[PDB]
Subunit: 232 residues, 4 copies
DNA sequence: CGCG
DNA sequence: CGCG
DNA sequence: CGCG
DNA sequence: CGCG
């Protein structure tokens, strides 16, 4: 399979596969069964912000998700990603729907990698164009609509569709850990708009790191958030 | 053909095809016959530095090349790159040898692109090069890992630079260099190099280039063509 | 006197002292009588954006001012700032009112300086302004904390802009803008603003300026003097 | 007194005041008695590198000190700096000598602060000039010698002097924590050269954060590393 | 750039 | 939100 | 920029 | 590296 390290924004509780009984941010290592979660006060129709953090010193992958004039949700997890991910990886955003639906609109996406042995990579998207050549769009992902990236399908009228799954990956491979490295670090930021006219919103957005050749697994709509082929 | 916009560091004056009678920095638009050149006091065996700058406001592609405790060579040229290059491009370094030889060692390479239309941005910095660099497309004789440097032309096991060589490094991701509905667009590019030649005739040179995404080394672009051009038109 | 190099956004044509017959962006070297101006379609009540750029290679101080879904105004001027400004300077925003009035609200302000001689660098970005901003020297009527914005000229409790007002924000740290033994020197400056006037005569304007470290608002630099100049020479 | 948060590079063991029996990196909160230390293989005469890290999510101040072709030393400590430092602070380098001497040469100094409520500050020094107007030099600190910052005094010949103390602070105050802030972070980097012809080298270099008006305390040469007035 |  |  |  |  693909090797997956993700930060999940789960909006629908799949209690069948260990999700808590409420919308959660979670830190996912190689399994949709998060290794740590937190209660997340999802605001239907409000534009939200996600900062994900890791360095080689603290070896702690942390994330904050937050809305204007509101409290935040934090989740952290201690993991050596040098023992999990290959040296070279791709970084990406994923999203899915199932029986229930939501828009998976990405307005902004920023990512920075540093290796003091210094080597560096930084990209920032605030507008998305119709032909975004430095993005690998997989599944139902689309660019150009209001200058935003729409990871799952949404009607001309605006109505989000169900049983949808799509991903954006940055075109260039990233060196996220080096053999002879003193410090390695990455920051990742994105703003999003999950809006659902149906009061049961599903299924969620995730930042992920994966092997370079990563592709949407067979039937990864819904509970699998476009990352995992099974709920193991 | 490929569309090429390059900054050439010509160490070998090919007077035959319009090169001045001396080693020159030049600004090359779609032709190896530079549209602007300047005298460059190339120092055999010394590590040197190249800054290249362009913006949508000044629409002026400029370059400075320099060695520690020595004077600089500057070249500028007014060109709307929105009228020359496609929207999406790759940025790269090229180098060649021919009748003579030189090492075309790159120790560092930095590039930044900005589009305010609310800014979109790409920045990469290489100070070490690994044996398996997946964020680089090596074409021709180009190789990485030797002293953690990028060697664009071939170097014998013995350490001596080889002749009739040509190789290019391109950054893996395509870059958006201009958009119609953008207010300001800009790029900076920096690289350090080591041109060293045991032969007192050093040839042929190093160049920063921007090109169509799918760009590839032209056949027989060894020598005066610097791995960019198929002909000296 | 203070030495001033400024980019003026003149909303009130003072034809008396060489302002063109319309609202203009201008490049001001040591005189309010700009050494280059351009027609600026100022939009009352709309948030606008200003990019200002200069390098040691092109020695050309350039500026773009623009509002969303509208054309830009550009101005450039060739000047060696190494021949004008001292080595160390402060960078600042200024604004004034006089016969009429306007709000001189600054929502954002970004500035970057680089000296490669191995690069020395300074960058600050303000998107919020707090009530107690210790990294800013407010002079005159300038104030912070109102909506998290910087209000260079006075605004009544009622919300209406006041006349015969002048205030300036300077970044606390001195900046090294040029060195003798430097190969490349550069600065970028960005700020968003809101000029809104209930009076259909809006006055007087906003300006980015560089100046000697100890620079201070000249006496009676309200109005056509934009808080930079003591006289209209 | 001044309010002090420092990362100490202690080269001489003052066992009198809790220093371990060997050269250590340590994380100092309001006392020269570090709240955590680590063994540091100081290389006399070799140029070394120091990365210091903190964010509001992990609330963990961490540091790595290292030399080329050698293993590193790490020290971390969990502390809310919003409960320790005032909102506005100055960031600085300090160094001292006592009975025993060393050079306290700084070749490089970089510092970055971020507040997503984004506000930002970044300065990088690779050369130091004779009149460095954006630095507040206190005590014996000097700039211009080889383009380096010399925090303690060193003879024309090169010989480092004893009972010396000097500090560099960046001119501008820094906002290191905001009331209504989602994320706050700072990185700090500096290269240094501690060289001692006397085989007993003392006393050390520190990165510090302090109240804006901070000044070298009375008799803070030696064990006090130019930060503390007493060894409490 | 140096030699014929 | 439906099915045991 | 609009009014005398 | 000196002093109990
Ligand atoms: O109208 C809103 C009603 C609230 C919904 C019920 C929430 N409670 C709940 C469920 N739901 C059952 C799980 O399976 C439902 C069908 O599964 C499909 O739909 C979702 C939506 O995208 C997807 O995650 C699945 O993979 C699949 O596509 C619990 O388990 C629980 O608690
Ligand atoms: O101060 C300026 C130095 C003057 C150099 C004079 C040139 N020396 C020289 C020539 N002249 C003719 C050049 O073409 C012959 C060489 O051809 C091959 O060698 C070079 C080496 O890269 C290459 O540019 C060509 O394209 C070709 O591969 C000599 O014959 C000689 O020696
Ligand atoms: O499309 C361009 C608009 C044309 C504007 C015409 C000017 N309107 C105007 C004048 N003309 C003389 C200007 O000086 C008198 C005003 O003096 C005070 O007001 C301004 C406001 O900031 C200031 O610049 C001056 O320095 C002084 O404080 C009027 O009298 C009038 O109305
Ligand atoms: O020639 C090298 C010999 C090694 C030195 C001894 C190390 N062992 C040791 C000490 N030393 C006694 C502490 O006080 C000594 C005098 O103190 C003065 O000198 C130092 C040097 O800068 C300074 O830290 C003091 O504040 C004061 O200025 C231990 O305690 C221990 O273990
Ligand atoms: Ca779920
Ligand atoms: Ca040539
Ligand atoms: Ca005016
Ligand atoms: Ca000590
Ligand atoms: Mn989940
Ligand atoms: Mn040429
Ligand atoms: Mn004017
Ligand atoms: Mn200690």
């Amino acid at each position: 399979a693909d090797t997956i390290v993700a930060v999940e924004l789960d909006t629908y509780p799949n209690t069948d596969i260990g999700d808590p009984s409420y919308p959660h941010i979670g830190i996912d290592i190689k399994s949709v069964r998060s290794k740590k979660t937190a209660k997340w006060n999802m605001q239907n129709g409000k534009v939200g912000t996600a900062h994900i953090i890791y360095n080689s010193v603290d070896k702690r992958l942390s994330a904050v998700v937050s809305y204007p004039n509101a409290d935040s949700a934090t989740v952290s997890y201690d993991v050596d990603l040098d023992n999990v991910l290959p040296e070279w990886v791709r970084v990406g955003l994923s999203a899915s729907t199932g029986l229930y639906k939501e828009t998976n609109t990405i307005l902004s996406w920023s990512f920075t990698s540093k290796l003091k042995s210094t080597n560096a990579l930084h990209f920032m998207f605030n507008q998305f164009s119709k032909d975004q050549k430095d993005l690998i769009l997989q599944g139902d992902a689309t660019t150009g609509t209001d200058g935003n990236l729409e990871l799952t399908r949404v009607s001309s009228n605006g109505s989000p569709q169900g049983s949808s799954v799509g991903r954006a990956l940055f075109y260039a491979p990233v060196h996220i850990w080096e053999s002879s490295a003193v410090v390695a670090s990455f920051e990742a930021t994105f703003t999003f708009l999950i809006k659902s006219p149906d009061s049961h919103p599903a299924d969620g957005i995730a930042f992920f790191i994966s092997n370079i050749d990563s592709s949407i697994p067979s039937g990864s709509t819904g509970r699998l958030l476009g990352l995992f082929p099974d709920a193991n």
